[PDB]
Each structure stands twice: as structure tokens, then as C-alpha cells.
Design a protein around this ligand. Structure first.
Ligand SMILES: [Zn+2]
Ligand SMILES: [Zn+2]
Lengths: 350, 350
């Protein structure tokens, strides 16, 4: 096994070290570059949300509800529970004539410290429409209603909406169903685990579909729906996360060149449209990147993901400098003195 | 290298894994048991506070200020900034005729979520007197004043109070000065790094001194002051951390049998008085334990420390059941469904 780490220091003395796993793949999933174990069996968590949004959009009758691109971005979101996220959740419930009591997700403290601070100040108790996954849950309810399934158990494995998700995830990964494992997420849905490179593969396919659409190429229904998802995420990145959030700031900086999505417990996935940068990396099409920090540290994840974009030449120094606060996280003590930093003793291998 | 981990799962699928280092030492620092690398060079951070309290108590003239056992517990503390912590900081400043403006530490969000909630509700901005290190800083101010040194720079490495700290830390570790490295902490004091087993050695010497004092043995002023520090921490565990904090709950459960202290970025140190448990572990005196979680995760630290006490037979099932919430942290989702767990595949070696 390779020894790929992100390391924090205090005055040059090792504080913490964190093992890094990464895969960089082409549009067919061929491995181009790796850190750590690029095939590590990994819980995709919320980084599977674009695959789940594809299952929702490929459910016949869902188009009749009139979900717009910001609604689709919400289906793809781990949102901050800003007022705009909660309002959009309730508007999406209205489009399908369902209620908050139909949701099978629960409230939680906001993923945004600033939102959560304002909640704590007002003694706000979050409810199901406040879930960071509320968009995905409304989409799954929409799919259940559309096929005339019945809604009470839309979240259970035996429900056709979860059968459709499970098949769709295996298909995008190019895996047999038995090579995908399932647990239960914080939002109370089935959540998949598969080799980390296949999370890269999903995002390479999303960006590849965007390339095919933009170029006016004939597309399958699946390619057209993947291109729609890419467009929705890139056009409404504030729905995918929120103000100050990595995914939002990343996708704003890149202005359509890529989409990126957080997985809880420090996974990350990026889908990169074909560019001079992807060609210099040795592929003629789109690219996928997937990352896992073995110990689950989010601050380290955003630092490593930003470092990998710099290493791979994706964007310009100017575009990437919008993410400087995440790339080289502040180590300023209570008296304003910088006490250390973050280092990246890992080596991309081809 | 040994492969000693604590692991979290979702539905039996690996989520995160965390590398554990631990040393179990006798009263002289002889290694009895280990996990990972027991000599890992480690920033002791707040777990060095008892060594710093010894430097303070050994400073000529400090005895004249009349610091009591709760004051000494606060010198040893990473407190929650409860009102009683702030009050005792102010009382200690008054004993040395100093003001809050003399402190060279800064305010920070409370180490207690409940305290920080009350602060957020009242728009409270924490100041120097609120620092989790405020007791250590008052003690260092006391030392500087007591020997007629300048007070303005009591926190600077060239100040005689910090020369006393540096020498004292190396002496308790049985190390030459050059074998201890120094950085700057969050509170803006010099902070040491030394092999992890020597953190265990410090706490074994604390517990050994307590045993010597209790038995009415003639003691040096250093051994008597180590005994006093142990007794202060054991008698005032609420000063060392606060309500609901691991160190307070651990030391209350053990009712004098041991002292325990958190280091920032997930170190831990325990000093165990001679007992039936220490004798079953193959030593005739007191014992020291030191732990580091390589990636810095606090929840995993408390889980591991509790599991290690169970494996070492320290306490009874009844004593250790007070720590159940830390030993096997809850993995219950937003809908009340248990989605995962914490496992300890590490193996103690002799
Ligand atoms: Zn979810
Ligand atoms: Zn401190």
C-alpha cells in the first residue's frame, strides 16, 4: 500500500496525519491517476445524490410535476437549510400534492455553522423539510406518486423507487448488483458503497453527458438526463450547498467547467468537462475525480480536493485562489498568531 | 509498525478508521503494554498542564499567594468556561493583584456545546478570562510576579517562567532539553512535544507521588507538589473540565483512584494509583497511560480510552458504566434508526 497523507503541523512538529485515497478516471472509468487505494470500498453517502436524482428524473411521469433546474439542484443537494432551501422544499411538496408529514427524513443541526448559530439563538427546532436531503426525499416521493406505487414506504428497499435507485447506481458504476453494498443514511434512505474509483466514474459520465449535450450530439434518454443534472448543479450551486460552502464556492469559481459534491464522512466527487487540462492528463474526453479521507475529516478533505485540482492543472491559479481558505486552512491562535499549517505528503501515481 | 485501529461502520460497511497509539508504563516509565507506536513524537498540548502546574508551584514566592486545591485543579484544566471557571480565574488574578488585561491568552468558543449555546443566545464575546487555559496563564503570571520578573512577557520562550517550564517538562520526562521540541499553543504559550510514552511517564509519576504522600513517606518538595497536583485534580475534577466532559465524568467515576486529562487534537493521559488492577498488570507501583488518535478525532479518543480501561481491568463494570455514552457513541439517524457502530480491532501487546 502507498503512504499518501495530508499532515498538520504546529511549528513544524507533526500534529495530525490523515490517510488519503483518490481516483482520477476517464469517461469510461479507466484509472489515470491514484492516491492510496483507488478501489477502496467506500460509502458514497451524499456524493451518490446525482445518481439518485437520475433515478428520480428517469421515473416516468416525474416531468409532469414541472420541477425546474433549481429543484433538480436541490435533489442533488446537501443544503445548508437556508430559508431559500426550506421554501423550495415546500414548493416542491406543493408541485406533487404531498405534505411534510409524508417525508421519511428528519431534522438535524444545519451543515452551516452560521445558519445553525441563528437557529440556536431563536431556539429553532428543525423539522423534516429542513433536512439537507429534503430535495432528494421530495424527488423520491414524486417518483412514488408518478408510478402509482404508494408513498408511505418510498424509503424502504422493497419500494420500487429504491429498486430503481439500486439498479441505477449499479448501472452508472458498471457493477453487478452484488458488488454494491447498502447501509442506511442519516436521512433514513438506503445508501450505497462501492469501490472509490466508481464514484469517479459516475462524475466522469455526468461531465461526459454535458459535453455531448453542449455539442448537439444525439443522446440517449440517460445521457440527456445526466446532462440536465450537470447543468442544474452548475447553474444553481447555491441549492447544492449554500453560502460559504465548499461545493457552492467551487462550482461558482469554475462557472460550468465542473460539478463537485460532498459525501458525509469526507468523500468528494468532481466531474470535469473536456478541456486543455483533461487533455494534458492523457484523455480526449471528460474526467472524474473521487477522494476519501480515511478518518473522515472534512477540513482535510477540502484542502486535499483543492490541492488535487492544482496538481491536475484544473482551472487557473486565479480560479483556484477563490478556494484558498480551504486549500491552506487558517492556523491562527486566540491571540492572532499563526501556529502551523497543512502539508500534502502524497504523490499522484499514473 | 503495528496496525491498531478504532473503526466506525454503517450497516457493517467501513465508514472511517482511526489509527491508535498508546503506552502503558510503570512508575519509572518502563513500557508494560502498547498500541501502535508507543514512542510516537507527540504534541502533549493540554495534557502537559500538570507538568506546567509543577513549574508554577516550584516557583519561589508562589506558596505566599495561597492558591488552594481548586485553584491548582484550574491550573491543570482545559475548562468549559462555565461561570464558576471564570469566577475562579478572577479570584486567582486577585490573589496575585493582577487584572484580566495582564492575561496573554485569548477567548474562544466554549469546549462545552451547552455553554457555547448560552453564549450564542446572549451574543457573548469570550475574552482572555474565558480561555480554557486561563488557570495555567494566571499561574504563569503568578510565577513571573513571585520572583520579581517582568509580567508583560511571562508567556515568551525567553522569559524565566518559560525557562522553568521547559526544564521542568524535560526533567519529568527524564529527557535532555534537546529531546523536547516546542511550538506555540492556541493560548499563545510554548507547548511541548516528546515521545508519547513519556506523557504516560509524567502521569505515572503523579500517581506514584500520591501513593508516596498517602503512605506518609518523606518526599522531596517536587514529589510532595506532584502529590498535591494529583490530589487537586481528583478532588476538583469539575475544575479540570466541567459538567458532561469526559475528564470530569471519568475522575468522578473513579473517586480518587486515577486522574485523567485531555490533550487537544486527541491525546489523553491517565495516572493510576497502585491497586489490585495495577498489580494484576504486573507492576508493584503506580501506572501511567497515554493515548494519541493519529487523525485527531476526540469522539474516537474517548471511545478508545474507555475500551483500554476495560481491557486493563481498571475500575469495575459498574464504575465504567458511567462512561457508556463515550465508550460506544450513539449512531442513531434523524428518524431514530441505529445505522452503525464503533469497533476496536486493536490488540494490546506486552
Ligand atoms: Zn440523504
Ligand atoms: Zn494552553
Amino acid at each position: 500500500p502507498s503512504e499518501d497523507f495530508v499532515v498538520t503541523d504546529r511549528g513544524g512538529i507533526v500534529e495530525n496525519s490523515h490517510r488519503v485515497h483518490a481516483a482520477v478516471v476517464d469517461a469510461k472509468g479507466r484509472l489515470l491517476y491514484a492516491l492510496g487505494n483507488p478501489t477502496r470500498m467506500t460509502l458514497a453517502r451524499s456524493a451518490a445524490k446525482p445518481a439518485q436524482a437520475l433515478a428520480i428524473l428517469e421515473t416516468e411521469g416525474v416531468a409532469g410535476y414541472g420541477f425546474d433546474d433549481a429543484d433538480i439542484a436541490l435533489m442533488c443537494a446537501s443544503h445548508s437549510s437556508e430559508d431559500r432551501h426550506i421554501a423550495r422544499t415546500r414548493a416542491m411538496l406543493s408541485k406533487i400534492k404531498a405534505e411534510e408529514a409524508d417525508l421519511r427524513c428528519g431534522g438535524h443541526p444545519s451543515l452551516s455553522e452560521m445558519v445553525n448559530r441563528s437557529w440556536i439563538k431563536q431556539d429553532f427546532i428543525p423539522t423534516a423539510v429542513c433536512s439537507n436531503c429534503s430535495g432528494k426525499h421530495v424527488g423520491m416521493l414524486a417518483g412514488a406518486r408518478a408510478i402509482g406505487a404508494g408513498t408511505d414506504g418510498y424509503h424502504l428497499p422493497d419500494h420500487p423507487m429504491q429498486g430503481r435507485v439500486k439498479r441505477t447506481v449499479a448501472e452508472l458504476c458498471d457493477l453487478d448488483a452484488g458488488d454494491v453494498e447498502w447501509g442506511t443514511d442519516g436521512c433514513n434512505l438506503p445508501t450505497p458503497a462501492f469501490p472509490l474509483d466508481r464514484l469517479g466514474r459516475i462524475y466522469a459520465k455526468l461531465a461526459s453527458a454535458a459535453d455531448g449535450s453542449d455539442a448537439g450530439e444525439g443522446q440517449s434518454t440517460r445521457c440527456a438526463a445526466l446532462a440536465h443534472i450537470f447543468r442544474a448543479m452548475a447553474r444553481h450551486p447555491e441549492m447544492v450547498a449554500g453560502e460559504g460552502r465548499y461545493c457552492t464556492m467551487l462550482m461558482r469559481a469554475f462557472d460550468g467547467a465542473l460539478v463537485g459534491k460532498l459525501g458525509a464522512d469526507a468523500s468528494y466527487a468532481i466531474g470535469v468537462r473536456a478541456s486543455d487540462a483533461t487533455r494534458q492528463l492523457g484523455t480526449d474526453g471528460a474526467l472524474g475525480i473521487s477522494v476519501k479521507i480515511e478518518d473522515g475529516n472534512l477540513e482535510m478533505l477540502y484542502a486535499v480536493v483543492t490541492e488535487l485540482l492544482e496538481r491536475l492543472g484544473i482551472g487557473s491559479p486565479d480560479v483556484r485562489s477563490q478556494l484558498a481558505s480551504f486549500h491552506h486552512p487558517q492556523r491562527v491562535n486566540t491571540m492572532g498568531v499563526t501556529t502551523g499549517g497543512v502539508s500534502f505528503p502524497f504523490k499522484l501515481r499514473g
